[PDB]
Amino acid sequence: HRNKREIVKHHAKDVELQRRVFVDFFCNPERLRNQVRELNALVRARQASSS
Amino acid sequence: EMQKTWLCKRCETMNAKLRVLENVLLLETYTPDSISALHNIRNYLVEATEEASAAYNKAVTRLREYQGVDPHFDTIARQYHDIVKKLENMQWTIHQVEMDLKSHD
């Protein structure tokens, strides 16, 4: 619980750092049409942090 | 000598620790569905099920729904093949009763 609860605070930026470095290189044009639906594009990084 | 006291000071804890957690899952199995029981205090339109239950009595209208072919009898004269598919629909209203009120029951 020291880390399982804290890893929630990590993915506030963990699903962002790898997303910005490489994922945004093919998702920034997508975000114009993904300005609402991007949470589905977010599931592949948030559940990884659940471990 | 001390096991009747300290090895048994948990005689009054294993009774409790085992028991207390038992009455936990049953309540937790209904919280995700409890929103509709609580977000719908005035929206208990489970009443609208019976305000919309009128889906049943139109089974009578199903007895006389396909009878619009009869006035234009010459239409099926050139379309004699379609009536074969219409055969399996005339008697559904008998058992539609069970469903069209199950539509709201």
């Binding site: - | 207390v20 209904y30 929103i35 609580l38 977000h39 489970v46 209208t61 234009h72």
Partner: protein, 99 residues
Amino acid sequence: VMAVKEEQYIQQYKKYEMLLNRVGYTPKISHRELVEMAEHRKELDKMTKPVLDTLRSYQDLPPDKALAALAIEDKKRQFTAAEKYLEEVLQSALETNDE
């Protein structure tokens, strides 16, 4: 090892009043009816499950019974529109069960 890890061992007593779990049926008393509204929609959807083969016959009406297509087609919808006038508020609460 029991200096501090007994906390979870001694926390088992504050949850003694938890025996109230029998109230679990109380939402099931209601929300099942609330999702019955959702269950009615699939039973509303059962209107066409014998009629899905009738749409095969209904497809052949407008080409032939063009004028009669406005007296038999919607007549099937009459037992599906027999609920729509209070279906919107039904959807307003089964969405808490579905949406």
